[PDB]
């Protein structure tokens, strides 16, 4: 049953951040981990992410969004940080538990 | 052209700008207060001591 | 110099047939751009407001020299002529240029700079790590009083 898929795909269109042309990961709140993840990003994937934001901001200040055409499509969202992040967390968790030993 | 004539003579020199506001407010005050009181008074004809006045102010005795 | 403002800065009055681009260009470390600009725009303001007789006296003498140094050799002269006829109509001799310069005095500079610099919306060009210098609005505001 595609239920789960059909749902995520929903909530995604629901959150509608993609109307600002932002990627899922683009929205993550920048905590100590993310912060580190972001520092690991290859320079291209990074300057890119930034512009995407500096554009989102420019929008949000104008009170507008992107013409439907340029909205981000669910299946095309690139989790550019998800993996980097996870690792970061992993590393930490190992350091963390290793200091309880 | 007033906007030019104005900007050129008043709003340009930050020093004259002031004199304009001052001298301006001054005029603005008078005109405003006058009409204001007027708009009000009229909207209340015959109800103010300014209207009733005469019936006792140097009328009896 | 005093505050290590820029690596360099330069005045310029690029002229054209019908128009022109009077301004200035400076290059500095990402972290002083502001203070720099600030002092600069100030000078402009000071120009349109308190230029002294001693200030112009020098400029004049400085200008006269470049005036001459532009005519240092063959190519240079030829250029001047090539361009004199093409833009100014005829040929403007140094004897002439010089009169026009000994003419200029304080009052004039003030009026003239004011004429073209005071409270005018300017053109800005930024390239590099410019984070520090910001808002045209603010740059604009730096065009009067200062």
């Amino acid at each position: 049953g595609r239920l789960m898929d059909r749902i995520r795909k929903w909530y995604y269109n629901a959150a509608g951040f993609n109307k600002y042309g932002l990627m899922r990961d683009d929205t993550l709140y920048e905590d100590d981990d993310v912060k580190e993840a972001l520092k690991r990003l290859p320079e291209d994937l990074y300057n890119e992410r930034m512009f995407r934001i500096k554009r989102a901001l420019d929008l949000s200040l104008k009170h507008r969004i992107l013409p439907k055409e340029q909205w981000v499509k669910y299946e095309e969202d690139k989790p550019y940080l998800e993996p980097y992040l996870k690792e970061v967390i992993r590393e930490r968790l190992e350091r963390e538990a290793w200091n309880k030993k | 052209a007033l906007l030019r004539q104005a900007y050129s003579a008043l709003f340009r020199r930050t020093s004259t700008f002031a004199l304009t506001v001052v001298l301006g407010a001054v005029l603005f005050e008078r005109a405003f207060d006058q009409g204001a009181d007027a708009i009000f008074e009229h909207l209340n004809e015959g109800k103010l001591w300014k209207h009733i006045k005469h019936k006792y102010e140097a009328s009896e005795e | 110099v005093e505050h290590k403002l820029c690596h360099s800065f330069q005045t310029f009055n690029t002229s054209y047939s019908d128009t022109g681009l009077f301004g200035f260009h400076f290059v500095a470390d990402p972290l002083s751009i502001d203070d720099m600009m600030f002092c600069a725009q100030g000078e402009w303001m000071r120009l349109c407001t308190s230029t002294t007789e001693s200030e112009v006296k020098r400029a004049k003498n400085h200008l006269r020299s470049a005036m001459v140094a532009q005519l240092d050799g063959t190519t240079p002269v030829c250029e001047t002529i090539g361009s004199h006829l093409l833009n100014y109509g005829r040929r403007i001799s140094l004897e002439e240029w010089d009169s026009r310069i000994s003419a200029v005095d304080a009052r004039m500079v003030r009026d003239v700079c004011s004429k073209y610099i005071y409270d005018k919306c300017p053109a800005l060009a930024a390239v590099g790590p410019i984070e520090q210098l910001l808002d045209y609005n603010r740059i604009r505001s730096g065009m009067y009083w200062i």
Binding site: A15, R24, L28, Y29, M50, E82 | - | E2, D35, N137, S141
Partner: protein, 380 residues
Amino acid sequence: MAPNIRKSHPLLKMINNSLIDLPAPSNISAWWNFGSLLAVCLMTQILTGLLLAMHYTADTSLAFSSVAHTCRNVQYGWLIRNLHANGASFFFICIFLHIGRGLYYGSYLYKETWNTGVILLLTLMATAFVGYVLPWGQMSFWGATVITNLFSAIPYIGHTLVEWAWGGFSVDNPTLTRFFALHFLLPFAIAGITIIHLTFLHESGSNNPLGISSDSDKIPFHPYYSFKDILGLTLMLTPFLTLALFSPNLLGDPENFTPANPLVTPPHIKPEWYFLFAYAILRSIPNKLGGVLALAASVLILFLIPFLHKSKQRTMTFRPLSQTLFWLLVANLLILTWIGSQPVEHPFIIIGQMASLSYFTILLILFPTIGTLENKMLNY
């Protein structure tokens, strides 16, 4: 050394780093003026307040008739009074929205900036409390008698803690004086704490609608947000005056136009509007202590929100679910308030007990829950 004074001067350097060259997000919305407006309220209460204190006479036998006198005899005194009074309300208005914003855009992640806020809020409430008791009207009195009594709920130190409050063994003059002295002082304490609130803030810069690094496009506080504050100034300033020039006593209970009577608690006694919601919660817990406790947490819970944040994202801008919950909560208060203004009977009583159950749950349970659920739907 330094070129432009604005940056070197020990004092200007300050005015500067917080009113002119201060880095502001390009996209902060209306809901961001409430901080400054709150300020303006503070400035307006302290001003009008000093003025009213110049004519007040803290003393049971005269406290009432002094205010009366201050309104009738003192030039423009009435206007002063009115302004001071509605100011209060407008203060609370501004503050409730200022909190709103904070909640919906998770500004509460600026913990300290936030905690101090609570403190400020709390104080304001206290401040506004004593202020009201001053006029020594029916409400003034009885409110004084209840609010303070609340502490009688604490065991041991309790019955004593009151003693101090009143300075007597019943609410009498001694109270009125120390309350005035208190009301006089407190506002200043707020002013101080605000200075801090703003400092902790300045450590992080301001938040912003989208809830993502704004470093990629900041703008000098001036002229941008400066002009924007003045507009927001006149904007609020309007209804405030309007309200205080055409219908002063609209937001104000008239039962307070009847000098306090230590012997008769008005049959229809209902708190200043800005307290109603809490009033309600306490009124739904039929138990001295519970009632008191419910109330405590009714406000103290604010301190928790920061820990009851679970969304991988910061603001609710991209969390339709949370949003819907949020507004439900707004309205949940909007309800609780109504009830406050309604007598203790049916349906009202039960409707109340629910909204209160409602309140706490949205904050303590649904929020963190709908939040988690939310990230799994985005797949994080």
